[PDB]
Symmetry: D2
Subunit: 283 residues, 4 copies
């Protein structure tokens, strides 16, 4: 199982959304789990969830790694509203076009920002809500912000290089000698091959200061069943936010992996797969 190889594109037409194409990787048959990737230079469905797609499939799942608008092999965009809203409107839209009643959502960081927005707007279109170190949520009660990884992320968006990209990924892992070439090079290329995307993301953050993403006062509204996951060592979104989530989502559980950076799903792939499949199978 690979990329190319699960490679699938699809034109979508929701809200303010004339013929816009989304690339995404897909596989298996079943109940539908969509995986939403993080917000940083050269992030896709496949780079973010390439360690998870197989196990989740080997488990009776129809899995779609989504390329959210303005990312990897999707179609470039500039937004005037928070990418959480927009991005989600895009989801409600890949569903409709692939004709899909309900999905399970797994959302990393910006992904998690999306997944939450989707649950807010499209309450009847979502199965179970899995949040992994999700972005947006206001200030930490303990971390100075911008956090180290946000500062590295904007560094990378503004002046992209390979040296600065490694710098970034090392901050992204607890154990940084886990960095592989597959990971490094994959991202290095959605960067090379989609330069328009770096430029467009900053402009959008110009229109939409990342403080505009804050769903907090509206968290009381989420009816979906939520699993909040976090790496103990997240240098990118703060830990205490899993608690913010925990106390504000009617039906939530928190799990925190130790010795794990921002990406629980890649760095703690095994436990992550297990915990989530299991949550999906039985919660």
């Amino acid at each position: 199982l690979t990329e190319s190889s699960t490679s699938k594109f699809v034109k979508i037409n929701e809200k303010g959304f004339s013929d816009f194409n989304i690339h995404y990787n897909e596989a298996g048959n079943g109940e539908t789990v969509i995986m939403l990737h993080g917000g940083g230079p050269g992030a896709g469905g496949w780079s973010n969830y390439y360690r998870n797609v197989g196990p989740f499939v080997d488990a009776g799942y129809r899995v779609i790694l989504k390329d959210s608008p303005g990312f990897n092999k999707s179609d470039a965009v500039v937004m005037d509203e928070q990418r959480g809203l927009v991005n989600a409107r895009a989801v409600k839209g890949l569903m409709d076009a692939l004709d899909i009643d309900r999905a399970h959502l797994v959302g990393n960081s910006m992904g998690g920002a999306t997944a939450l927005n989707f649950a807010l707007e499209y309450p009847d279109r979502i199965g179970k809500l899995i949040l992994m170190g999700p972005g947006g949520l206001g200030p930490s009660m303990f971390a100075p912000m911008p956090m180290e990884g946000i500062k590295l992320l904007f560094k990378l968006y503004a002046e992209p290089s390979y040296e600065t990209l490694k710098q970034m990924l090392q901050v992204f892992l607890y154990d940084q000698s886990l960095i592989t070439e597959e990971l490094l090079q994959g991202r290095w290329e959605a960067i090379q091959r989609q330069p328009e995307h770096l430029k467009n993301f900053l402009i959008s953050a110009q229109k939409a200061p990342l403080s505009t993403w804050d769903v907090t006062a509206r968290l009381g509204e989420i009816k979906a069943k939520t699993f909040i996951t976090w790496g103990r060592d997240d240098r990118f979104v703060p830990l205490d936010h899993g608690l913010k989530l925990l106390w504000n989502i009617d039906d939530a559980r928190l799990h925190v992996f130790s010795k794990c950076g921002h990406w629980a799903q890649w760095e703690h792939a095994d436990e992550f797969n297990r915990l989530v499949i299991d949550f999906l199978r039985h919660a």
Copy 2:
């Protein structure tokens, strides 16, 4: 054999470190990889009472399950302790393993039993498999919660003035959803208090000799090599939630799981999630 409190009920004498032909009450079913479950420290606590919603599912998953009554609780022998209970309780757990020919056991510990499970991994690293913690005590001050917490000290009020009403108040504070309480649980804790009044009095004497602060093993948590699963009820009014980060940060190989809408007793109030999550951890972590 059908699995009931009496059908599982057993006794063994232990002879570890100053225990000498000291009688341990426990409840045992299943066969194979051993899981010993260690109960909390309130009046009338016992293995069966803390863990009767967990024992069947753990046995059915292929474990041999031991619900041990610590020294000075329930049907075990009485004792006035002049040392911290977590360490004393951990010698007793070793003593029971020795007597029963058990080389290594996974530990599930609630509160005083989480304290006890921590000391056991510190003192006998070679006798432990996995370590499961469920709002353990023995962990010092909280960075947020004024102490003694509410639960604590309904606990102490109940030890000094045992009454049926204070017992109900205490148990309710253990729960997020107070209506889940049953008259039978209550009556079970109440019989255990009434039929062993000496344990309450010996508890208070023991605590004078060795206040709760002497149970704090924070400075040694870095020695724990057991793979660790810490669990907390979000709504625990007995031991503070930030202690689950304390463990998460201070033990080498830990992970933490918080259940929402859950008092102190996650294994009882969320038995089903708890059983499923801890069984998986045992099998695959």
Copy 3:
């Protein structure tokens, strides 16, 4: 200096506010500091700030311990909106009638809920903002709620007795053998002499679940200069909230007394007087 003795009443006429009288204690000349008391059975300006009034005056201040509506020797009321709003509308109204341009506000708990509401609505009518263990602010990230003291407070509102009142005050102090007769009996009497107030407060909490008080999403708006104080051992409002405050008020400082219950101003009167007078004189 005493009660009676600073005793002053005054009819007020703001928003939905036909001739309503407020009792309040007053003294000295100067810049105006209004002190707003907490939300529990038999709480006034004088019982709450009787340890502070003298020092603050001895320091060149015109001090007014305000009886917020539906409390002590004021006029009973039932509210359909959060007492923070309402209570503040009352402030904007005692000012106008005593003809007062600007005030310094010190607000304990419900007081603090008020003081904050006043800063939100009447941004040009307030000097410096002193918050002491202020109420309302959403859920804690660490304390189970209702907190112990809230549960005792509602206990006392619903079935008032002297036994339950002592129970309550002991939870209110870190060191509870500091309880005096002046304190005990003062409260025991706004209880006896204002039974209508117990009844009316519950009804209001009926219309206005204390979760309606949450100013949080609007904290970015406060332009006043704020001093957040808390007792380390507050069993009534959570500690972590001084951090919520700290991170969301443009100009804030946090101070936390140790070995101190909910009432820093009474239990740590000396340091409290000093810290606040000093903040008032020089921040």
Copy 4:
């Protein structure tokens, strides 16, 4: 005499515990009740550099102010330490008091100096007056912040590869408002690095012998009887804010003050508030 870095500049030999005719650089003005100020642990730190915005106001308030250069920083003697620096630095503070006939001193400690101030109150309870802490290190893991924090380890990068640019990056991370930085502060830290290159190398050697974890005195905080004033910058990217609750909870008589919009250096970035608040505390607490 006018109060300038050189007009205050002095040396004394100390002979405490294995220090023997070891030369301490310090900056001193004023007379009376003594306040000793203990600087942090980054490359090029010294008493004057950490505290030149505080010394005039403390002297003017009626204190005798001592800005001490710890062993192996700035103009003090060089040293490779095989023990934790906080304890070693605290013996040196005692040695300087002894040599100077000072019976008791109030301590203000920043970071490594907060660590140093803690050890000093533990080891010599009778030689301390009040204890003022300003984001002290020596306090173990954080319950929220991944470690090493950002600041830490620009600190270590700068110790191993001293450069003017990494120095600027480091100092900026110390600040909430990065533009408050001055070329003269920078140039002062840079001269101190260049003129005593051995201190950086001896620092890294010392830390190999005694990692930062050996500086953690959390288990003994309960012995501190000094009346304590802990202060933190909200925005400290060098030592974690939750450690200010750790102290607040674990020291008998403490209070905590957090300045908003403030990096690690509250005494510099909020000098004025800091000076006023710490002076009052000294006078009236």
